Amino acid sequence: GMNVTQPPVVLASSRGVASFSCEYESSGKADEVRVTVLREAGSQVTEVCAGTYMVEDELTFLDDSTCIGTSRGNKVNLTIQGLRAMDTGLYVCKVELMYPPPYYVGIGNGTQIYVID
Ligand SMILES: *[C@@H]1O[C@H](CO)[C@@H](O[C@@H]2O[C@H](CO)[C@@H](O[C@@H]3O[C@H](CO)[C@@H](O)[C@H](O[C@H]4O[C@H](CO)[C@@H](O)[C@H](O)[C@@H]4O)[C@@H]3O)[C@H](O)[C@H]2NC(C)=O)[C@H](O)[C@H]1NC(C)=O
């Protein structure tokens, strides 16, 4: 089907940088993949950042002001920077196989990110 795995807990650095991996297992023949980071507090859901990458590549597919994502095959590293204590929360990796059809979607269990000031 579509298992998305990410580490349950991570600690931001003193500079406000937190890194976690997100990995997927699937029967789909992934080529184009959309990875979305969702911050979740119960039913409160907010999109943090998102990027598209090509499975056969190996690159830095995401680099907005806040997230940096690198990808290799079915694994990605995600890094969120500029974190402060109030940004503490559950960050859920969502993965979509976007092309070719058929479409697949999976959601991870979430990485709880703790930030000390
Ligand atoms: C997510 O982040 C982690 C942590 O930074 C990152 O892990 C790093 O991956 C690189 C590349 O796979 C690792 O370096 C390789 O592994 C060993 C180190 O002992 C070497 O044998 C390898 O050398 C070969 O490959 C090189 C090309 O990359 C050649 O230049 C070389 O001549 C050899 O042929 C290579 O150096 C590195 O060890 C890890 N770092 C850690 C701390 O684990 C991971 O890749 C990131 N994942 C994604 C999807 O971005």
Q: Which atom of ligand 1 is nearest to the CA of 75?
A: 49
**Experimental approach taken:** X-ray
Between CA 22 and CA 61 the distance in angstroms is 14
Instruction: Look up residue 88 and give its two tokens.
Output: 């503490």
Closest to 98 (Cα-Cα) out of 52, 33, 2, 36 = 33
Token couple for 75? 């694994």
Question: Is residue 117 packed enough to be buried (19+ CB in 10 Å), middle (13-18) or exposed (0-12)?
Answer: exposed
In contact, 36 and 46? CB cutoff 8 Å: no
DSSP character at residue 87: G
- Domains of the chain plus CATH, in order, are 1-117 (2.60.40.10)
Give the Å distance between the CA of 70 and the centre of ligand 1. Answer: 12
